[PDB]
Amino acid sequence: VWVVGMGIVMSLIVLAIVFGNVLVITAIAQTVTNYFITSLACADLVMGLAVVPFGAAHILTTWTFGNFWCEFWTSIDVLCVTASIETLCVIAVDRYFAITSPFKYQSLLTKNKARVIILMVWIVSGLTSFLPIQMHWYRATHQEAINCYAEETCCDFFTNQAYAIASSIVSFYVPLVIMVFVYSRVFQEAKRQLQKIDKSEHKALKTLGIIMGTFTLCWLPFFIVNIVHVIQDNLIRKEVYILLNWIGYVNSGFNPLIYCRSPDF
Amino acid sequence: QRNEEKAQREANKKIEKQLQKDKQVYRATHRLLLLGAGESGKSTIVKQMRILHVNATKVQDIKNNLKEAIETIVAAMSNPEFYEHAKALVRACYERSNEYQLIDCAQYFLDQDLLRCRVLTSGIFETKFQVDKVNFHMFDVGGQRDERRKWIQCFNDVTAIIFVVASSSYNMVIREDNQTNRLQEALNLFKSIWNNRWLRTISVILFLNKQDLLAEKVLAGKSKIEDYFPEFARYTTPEDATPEPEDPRVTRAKYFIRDEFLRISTASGDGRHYCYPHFTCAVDTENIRRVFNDCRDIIQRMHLRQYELL
Amino acid sequence: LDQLRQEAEQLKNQIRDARKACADATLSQITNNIDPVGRIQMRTRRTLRGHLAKIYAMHWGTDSRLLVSASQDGKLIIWDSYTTNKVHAIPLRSSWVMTCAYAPSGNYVACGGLDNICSIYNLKTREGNVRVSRELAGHTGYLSCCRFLDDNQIVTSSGDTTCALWDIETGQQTTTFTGHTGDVMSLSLAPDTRLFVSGACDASAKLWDVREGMCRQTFTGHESDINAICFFPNGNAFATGSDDATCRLFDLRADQELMTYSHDNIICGITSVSFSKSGRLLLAGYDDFNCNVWDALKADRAGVLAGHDNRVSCLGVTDDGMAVATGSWDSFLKIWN
Amino acid sequence: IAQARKLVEQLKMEANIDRIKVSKAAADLMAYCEAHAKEDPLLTPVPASENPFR
Ligand SMILES: Nc1nc2c(ncn2[C@@H]2O[C@H](COP(=O)(O)OP(=O)(O)OP(=O)(O)O)[C@@H](O)[C@H]2O)c(=O)[nH]1
Ligand SMILES: CN[C@@H]1CCc2c(ccc(O)c2O)[C@H]1O
DSSP: OHHHHHHHHHHHHHHHHHHHHHHHHHHHOOOTTHHHHHHHHHHHHHHHHHTHHHHHHHHHOOOOSOHHHHHHHHHHHHHHHHHHHHHHHHHHHHHHHHHHSSTTHHHHOOHHHHHHHHHHHHHHHHHHHHHHHHHTTTOOOSSSHHHHHHOTTOOOOOOOSTHHHHHHIIIIIHHHHHHHHHHHHHHHHHHHHHHHHHHHOOHHHHHHHHHHHHHHHHHHHHHHHHHHHHHTTSOSOHHHHHHHHHHHHTHHHHHHHHSOOSTTO | OHHHHHHHHHHHHHHHHHHHHHHHHHHTEEEEEEEEOSSSSHHHHHHHHHHHTOOOOHHHHHHHHHHHHHHHHHHHHHOOHHHHHHHOOOHHHHHTGGGSOOOTTHHHHHOOOTTSSOOOOOSOEEEEEESSSOEEEEEEOOOSOOSSOGGGGTOSSOSEEEEEEETTOSSOBOSSTTSOBHHHHHHHHHHHHHTOSSOSSOEEEEEEEOHHHHHHHHHSSSOOHHHHOGGGGGOOOOSSOOOOOOOHHHHHHHHHHHHHHHHHHHHHOSSSOOEEEEEOOTTTOOOOHHHHHHHHHHHHHHHHHGGGOO | OHHHHHHHHHHHHHHHHHHHHTOOSOHHHHTTTSOOOOOOOOOEEEEEOOOSSOEEEEEEOTTSSOEEEEETTTEEEEOOTTTTOOOEEEEOSOSOOOEEOOOTTSSEEEEEOTTSOEEEEESSOGGGOOOEEEEEOOOSSOEEEEEESSSSOEEEEETTTEEEEOOTTTTSOSEEEOOOSSOEEEEEEOTTSSEEEEEESSSOEEEEETTTOOEEEEEOOOSSOEEEEEEOTTSSEEEEEESSSOEEEEETTTTEEEEEEOOSSOOSOOOOEEOOSSSOEEEEEOSSSSEEEEETTTOOOOOEEOOOSSOOOEEEEOTTSOOEEEEOTTSOEEEEO | OOHHHHHHHHHHHHHSOOOOOHHHHHHHHHHHHHHHTTTOTTTSOOOGGGOTTO
């Protein structure tokens, strides 16, 4: 009973992610700041359609597809993961620019600037994932990866090379050190305004708290254990790694439901 | 003619091309509507922008104001040679000027010069300028008094509304005699503007104009506010008072008018409505940053409110 | 003194008594045997974009192919309905515009607004440069409508309870009309251009005479302001759209109101009315973001056009009765067929 | 002043006019609509082959 019902659970998560992202994308398809949300929704839909069904069969059981197919999947995983995270920093920067500098907000950002920014960030995200996979330069030299590299039906991930650290540094460490400062400045600006109101005559805390906490709780353990396991002498089990990776994947299912709260987005 | 479609396509292109350039300019401007009662100071504030922010029949017009003021005072007394005749010049009639209608600029002309005269215009009066490379667009609809105000639905997209009131006119009737004193007439206009169907998301900047005349009226013992406003007897100075450098009597009078305007605003204001009271003198005060500093608050508050933060 | 006011009541009572005698039978009973029109449904054919702000004015051309629109961004664009291609874009001296027109010969376009001045532009000129021809500036208060009797005469209706018949060549008022106690908001010329009406803000409408310059009749059946008016194609009746939910149809010969159009759910106002080619359908705009289609002889709603994201402020029907154009406040025009 | 005097003189002009019964006006309107209902493209839809906008 338990294996097949958990499979029912994976199927349910997949249907849900696909329906939500697709509906939001269709209603949006329009503001200067909605292009980033559309990109996030498109990346979420692509990841949900391409990664979870493929990983479900491997988690349940032998990898039927070929070596090239497995390489493509384990390469697109990084591209999908790093594409959604990098957009949140852009959204935070845009909000900070809009609030802190009201008059220059119209002049600073335009459709062409948004297109250039989105193209640059997508190119940066894509260059990190597919290039090492095609080059095969990141392959580990340990005695445990030889079996996986030799068997076309066995799939596993291992990288003791520095690449894992950079992957994290440029996937997850860079966005948060900026987002924390951005939202702290936004909160400070909001706190000044109420005080001014008092002389003439907290939902903000809750919304900033949820916005931070969702992605923080979803993604911090994964990028913690990812750095931890390489340095340590196998102190982390592979199953726990897969479970934490899936828990991190869950974030994209609910991220479009966070934003778009305003009715009839 | 294949050519006929080609030319038309070419003509649509030039027109569509300009409308792209015009869109950027239009979206980066701020429009400020002026409202007030009769003889308040809406025109003078606009002139203050043309004298410092940006950039002759005045001589004849100035003489006409002096001529009209000369006959008004002497008429109520019963109830080159032409200028010299009125020069010799009745003083007690000018002292009791609240019992009839008389122009404020009568004393100065008879005894900032170009901006002290009064001129009445029916057409819309407009002004454009820049202060910090940010476009601003100030205009005054004006005209003779209208009690329907059916054009107010047009101004449904302005950034803010500037309101000007005369704070030294609490003992004078307006137009037809026996009516309510001018200060009460301004209050009734404020309620209609504040509780308006179309203007449900527009902020109001309140200018309490003509402060210099208020100080001298209270200093003299001519008229007391308690007579016209009975509720002034029980009024007390608010604890959160920060008077500039003033006598306690003058400071109390300044606020009682201000807090009396506020109780209308706070009653029906549940979000998307703010009032910013200021104490200004139109002719003398030299800084236009008051509008600039305020206009940066409506935007930010609007953005902050946007996104659910506040 | 008081005797004149005493006689005013007697004359006022005399008019009502005369109208009560002529009410032989209501129009509802006589047309009870006419088969209903049914259900009328139309789909958007063309959408015209290119305006930066809300729109108040719109008028077709004699050829029923070109139309002109006005908006408060400072532009007066002329479209080509068949192929959706702009032809002209005239910048304006003032940013506040409330009306526009189109000459019968297509050689002129009129405009006006809060600037108290009516402006006339030239289209067919040497070197292809549109320039202001004349500037009619004698009024006080804003303007509401402009109509072209010919290339030399234009009728305006300012906001000081007056109307005038101008003259472009001399730029002076030939005649002026008085009698309204409230702001005038609309007018519509007769098919023979011999009479016209005007819906004021005092819940009344009159029937002026172009030549004699005197009032002829007065209908006072409404209860609020009046925003629109239009003649029947026959030329002996007109329909009125007031601030309340009701719209009424008056008759010149019988000098009485004939029918009333209202619905329980509708509690909004009306901003524009117009008829069809044969005078069988009475379209009418509304403030609740759509346009309804009534029936002239049955008072039965027979369709709704709700493809707009903002209130409808203008409406018109081509001279051949092939399309209906409805502007709105979201800077979008539409063509229905 | 004499505003009332002007008003009453105007009202006397409209007091004496020729009026007809409502039945005749309704019959005229119904006859006109019935006669001209043939060429009403909005009322009776025209085929798409003869529609300039389709
Ligand atoms: N003493 C004094 N007079 C002022 C001040 N501001 C405006 N005025 C008066 O304003 C006069 C100029 O005409 P205004 O009263 O401004 O006329 P206006 O503002 O065009 O009148 P509205 O059409 O009602 O706006 C001056 O002669 C002064 O009497 C002020 O700060 N002090
Ligand atoms: C186990 N699948 C991959 C492997 C490593 C990796 C992931 C996500 C983001 C990264 O920057 C990574 O380096 C995981 O989703």
